[PDB]
Design a protein around this ligand. Structure first.
Ligand SMILES: [K+]
Ligand SMILES: [K+]
Ligand SMILES: [K+]
Ligand SMILES: [K+]
Ligand SMILES: [K+]
Ligand SMILES: [Mg+2]
Ligand SMILES: [Mg+2]
Ligand SMILES: [Mg+2]
Ligand SMILES: [Mg+2]
Ligand SMILES: [Mg+2]
Ligand SMILES: [Mg+2]
Ligand SMILES: [Mg+2]
Ligand SMILES: [Mg+2]
Ligand SMILES: [Mg+2]
Ligand SMILES: [Mg+2]
Ligand SMILES: [Mg+2]
Ligand SMILES: [Mg+2]
Ligand SMILES: [Mg+2]
Ligand SMILES: [Mg+2]
Ligand SMILES: [Mg+2]
Ligand SMILES: [Mg+2]
Ligand SMILES: [Mg+2]
Ligand SMILES: [Mg+2]
Ligand SMILES: [Mg+2]
Ligand SMILES: [Mg+2]
Ligand SMILES: [Mg+2]
Ligand SMILES: [Mg+2]
Ligand SMILES: [Mg+2]
Ligand SMILES: [Mg+2]
Ligand SMILES: [Mg+2]
Ligand SMILES: [Mg+2]
Ligand SMILES: [Mg+2]
Ligand SMILES: [Mg+2]
Ligand SMILES: [Mg+2]
Ligand SMILES: [Mg+2]
Ligand SMILES: [Mg+2]
Ligand SMILES: [Mg+2]
Ligand SMILES: [Mg+2]
Ligand SMILES: [Mg+2]
Ligand SMILES: [Mg+2]
Ligand SMILES: [Mg+2]
Ligand SMILES: [Mg+2]
Ligand SMILES: [Mg+2]
Ligand SMILES: [Mg+2]
Ligand SMILES: [Mg+2]
Ligand SMILES: [Mg+2]
Ligand SMILES: [Mg+2]
Ligand SMILES: [Mg+2]
Lengths: 97, 93, 51, 50
RNA sequence: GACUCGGUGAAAUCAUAGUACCUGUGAAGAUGCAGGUUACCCGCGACAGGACGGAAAGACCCCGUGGAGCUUUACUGUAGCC
RNA sequence: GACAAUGGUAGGAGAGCGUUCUAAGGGCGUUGAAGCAUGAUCGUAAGGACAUGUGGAGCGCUUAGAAGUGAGAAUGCCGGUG
RNA sequence: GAGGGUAGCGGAGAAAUUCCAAUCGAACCUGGAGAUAGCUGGUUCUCUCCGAAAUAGCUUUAGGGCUAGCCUCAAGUGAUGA
RNA sequence: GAGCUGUAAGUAAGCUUUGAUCCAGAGAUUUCCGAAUGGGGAAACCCAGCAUGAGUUAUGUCAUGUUAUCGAUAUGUGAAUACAUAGCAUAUCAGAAGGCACACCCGGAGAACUGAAACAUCUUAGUACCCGGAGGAAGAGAAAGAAAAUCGAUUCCCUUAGUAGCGGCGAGCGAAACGGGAAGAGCCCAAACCAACGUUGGGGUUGAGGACAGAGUUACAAAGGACGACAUUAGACGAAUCAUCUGGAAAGAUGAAUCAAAGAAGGUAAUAAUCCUGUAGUCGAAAAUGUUGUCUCUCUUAUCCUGAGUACGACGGAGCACGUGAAAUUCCGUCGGAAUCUGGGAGGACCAUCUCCUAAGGCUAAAUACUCUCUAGUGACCGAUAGUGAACAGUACCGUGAGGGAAAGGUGAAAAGCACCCCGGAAGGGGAGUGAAAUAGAACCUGAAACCGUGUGCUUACAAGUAGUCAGAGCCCGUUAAUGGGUGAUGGCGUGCCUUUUGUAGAAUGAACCGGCGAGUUACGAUUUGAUGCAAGGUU
């Protein structure tokens, strides 16, 4: 309340809408992928078990922050272009599942 | 456990160590009246009359028929009827 | 180690003595006591559970 | 009779009732004719007029 | 009635009070501050100038986006009538 | 040890006093507890002791915990008495 | 005079806002209920350090409020202050 | 298992070991009013009719039974009116009535102050109040569901989440599904079609099924028995301490012992594990209520149909978190009004496809809600202005009435409650006695302050004052022994406190005085800081 002056949240306009079908992913970066040893197959179940991912959300997306330094077979729902390129260029492989 | 006519010893009060016969009992007050114990010296308006006043029953104790020692009271069921037995010796009262 | 009824019944009337089990240990009881008398099995269980 | 609201253009509300369309009709109850109040919907959805 | 004596015996009020006047000062009208002036201690009958005396959180006046009764071609409704 | 600072309303910050209850520890008490009264006592303050008298059965201290925790004003409420 | 009747969004009124159980522009009792009160009053121990404002803007706003200004506490920066 | 005739004294008369008073179960009696019910009535009263029976020559009077209204059942009399019906009598039954803690629950009906800094939509709130109906719970409940990989009745708890959304898009209002838990349970009809007289039995109960071609009195059907066991409603047993000291009294102090499945707690002349009542433990029921078992006991082994004035629609409303909105879903009034497994409904307007389901019949325990009650217990809850309004009361008192509504606890361990003497009519005192103590003497523990008195060490009748403070002789005392205490001639300075104000000695506010009571609290969220634990993890 501003003593009768029009409040800020009445003088400003409403904006946008909420998407009812919005998808949000649990994100894993390459520096988090460093935790596993070479040759390991990474799955959402493995990620939740080892504790990297706490809540699965709409799926698991691999992102390209940090440096991987390991050779892994990463099975996830989504990969960023940089994450896929780094996984493939470190000797490993990735698959969208 | 204390009954009229019983021989008791006073174990607390001015008359501690005295012995005397139980004149009367008062179960609602948990008190007893003992001969020669707790004289009161009341002013009577028809002189000064000396009479015993009641004392709390827990201030007197039964005496053992064998060793004469003051004893607490237990119970047994001799011939069906409940009977009193001294805790000191084990003999009936 | 566990609920020992005869030990508990023997000890429960002495002033200042208190009897508990391994799982029953608590800070109030332990700190209030001046000494702990523990059986070997109870001590092993305490080590096992508190790690 | 049911109860609800009369609403104005400004949406002011006052309590009001909705009454059944009762019509006094000669009806055979228990095998003996009598004039009872029965709704028109009930009459269309065959009491039994005598 | 008041007044004196015998009997009985309230009340409103009340920050504590050993409670003067003048001219001044001051929230601009002072028992209580200044400078003077006057005044031995304690009652009783009287008078009403002051204690902005007592009494009732001013009725006047204004203010509150207070209340209530009343009016109408104020607004929105509505019993009822067509 | 030698320099500096320390008027204060609304208000911010800090440190403490005291009251009742609880826990643990350690104590006092019919050879007289609490309470009450008096005194020429002690601490920078809130406040703390001691002695005597009264009283006649409960009560301090330490640390921590918890609050119905401190009254002089509300034309406050009740009681007592002017 | 006796026995009765009319009841508060109502009665009654030879009409005065008149009467309805000692105050009627809408009786009394209980409840919603601790209505609401931007108003008045009140708000209880101590010491220590700092210490304002009575202005601007907007406000059915003008003895209210909000943001800024001015106070305080704590972290930072560091010459940017006088 | 010895006292007893309530509280409750006091005498009087009695009762009780041939078992009283008392306690528990079961019976008997149970005046009148009150729904109140034979009629009336200003409750606790008045007046009656029938039948039976005392009594009286007879009447008067008396005792028992019965007689309300609306209802059921079945016998008559029976209108206008032919028959009948309505109506009127009788006989039998006893179904309803009224009350509550009616707290919790379901339903009908339903505000306003208030918030929105005005106010009307909205909010307060489907709340208060009123009315009706019940139960130990009620309500809901066995998918025309949730959904989008599938689940599988209902309810409640956590979370989702102050999210999605609703909203003069203001103030505010505000889900659900998923997931995690408590609990867990499923069934009966209508209809197709058979056999007996449309009504009865069989048939059947669904997401495709049906027709056709061992279970139970807790729903699922309803009555008993036999016996057992357990529980409640009285009770019983139950270990162990003596001495001295101070004291009126010992449980306290000291010494030396003892018991403990008992060191809970009360009481006892001060503070007791061993004095008492008890406690740990153990035992106990003639009778009545309950719970629960085994045996018994019975019950049982797509031709057709599938809920019609329905679903649904229009209008007007309401309930859904959702204010008519793109508003699905549910309900009411008015009016219209389908289809029939090649069917019907839902998946948030609607269409199509797909997916799920199968309305218009009913029943159903448990997990949940509450406390006037009862039993057993608990408290960093009160301790007589507190705690219930009420420790001795819905009383006294106030009001026509609805209704409002207090004040008031404490002798002592034991009444030992003051024999007797003296003044006094008494009241009240002084002695003497009781008592540890009477300034513990009932108006009784302690006994503060205001306030009222008596005595007097210093001082005061020439003095102008917020009463003190600083200086200071004189006089009187002598301490928590301190460069002391009381008083005070005289001199200097000096207009109370609070509140509210630019500014108050203010002639602005408030307080007669004293005492008690009397105001930032708690819950759930947010944020920030300090502390602590762990750390790419932390935490339920
Ligand atoms: K500000
Ligand atoms: K209801
Ligand atoms: K307002
Ligand atoms: K049939
Ligand atoms: K509609
Ligand atoms: Mg004259
Ligand atoms: Mg006179
Ligand atoms: Mg001045
Ligand atoms: Mg002037
Ligand atoms: Mg003057
Ligand atoms: Mg002067
Ligand atoms: Mg005079
Ligand atoms: Mg005046
Ligand atoms: Mg005024
Ligand atoms: Mg200075
Ligand atoms: Mg200062
Ligand atoms: Mg502060
Ligand atoms: Mg502090
Ligand atoms: Mg303190
Ligand atoms: Mg307080
Ligand atoms: Mg006052
Ligand atoms: Mg008038
Ligand atoms: Mg006029
Ligand atoms: Mg008139
Ligand atoms: Mg009048
Ligand atoms: Mg309200
Ligand atoms: Mg109020
Ligand atoms: Mg300063
Ligand atoms: Mg009658
Ligand atoms: Mg009647
Ligand atoms: Mg009831
Ligand atoms: Mg408003
Ligand atoms: Mg014993
Ligand atoms: Mg539909
Ligand atoms: Mg169907
Ligand atoms: Mg008292
Ligand atoms: Mg009281
Ligand atoms: Mg005394
Ligand atoms: Mg006294
Ligand atoms: Mg002189
Ligand atoms: Mg002179
Ligand atoms: Mg002066
Ligand atoms: Mg002014
Ligand atoms: Mg004055
Ligand atoms: Mg004023
Ligand atoms: Mg005044
Ligand atoms: Mg006062
Ligand atoms: Mg606050």
């Amino acid at each position: 309340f501003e003593g009768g002056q029009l409040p800020l949240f009445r003088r400003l306009p409403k904006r946008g809408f909420t998407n009812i079908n919005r998808k949000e992913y649990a994100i894993v970066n390459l520096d988090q992928l460093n935790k596993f040893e070479d040759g390991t197959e990474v799955t959402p179940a493995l990620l939740v078990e080892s504790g990297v991912v706490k809540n699965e959300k709409s799926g698991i997306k691999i992102l390209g922050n940090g440096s991987l330094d390991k050779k892994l077979t990463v099975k996830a729902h989504k990969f960023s272009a940089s994450a896929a390129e780094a996984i493939d260029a470190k000797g490993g492989a990735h698959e969208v599942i | 456990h204390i009954k009229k006519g019983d021989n008791v010893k006073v174990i607390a009060g001015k008359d501690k160590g005295k012995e005397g016969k139980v004149i009367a009992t008062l179960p609602k007050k948990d008190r007893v009246v003992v001969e020669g114990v707790n004289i009161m010296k009341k002013h009577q308006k028809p002189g000064i009359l000396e009479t015993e006043a009641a004392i709390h029953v827990s201030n007197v104790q039964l005496l053992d028929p064998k060793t004469n020692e003051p004893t607490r009271v237990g119970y047994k069921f001799v011939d069906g009827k409940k009977v009193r037995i001294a805790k000191k010796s084990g003999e009936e009262i | 180690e566990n609920e020992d009824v005869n030990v508990e019944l023997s000890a429960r009337n002495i002033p200042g003595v208190q009897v508990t089990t391994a799982q029953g240990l608590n800070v109030l009881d332990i700190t209030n006591a001046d000494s702990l008398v523990i059986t070997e099995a109870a001590a092993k269980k305490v080590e096992e559970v508190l790690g | 009779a049911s109860t609800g609201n009369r609403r104005s253009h400004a949406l002011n509300s006052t309590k009001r009732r909705w009454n059944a369309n009762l019509q006094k009709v000669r009806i055979l109850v228990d095998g003996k004719p009598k004039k009872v109040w029965v709704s028109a919907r009930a009459l269309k959805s065959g009491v039994t007029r005598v």
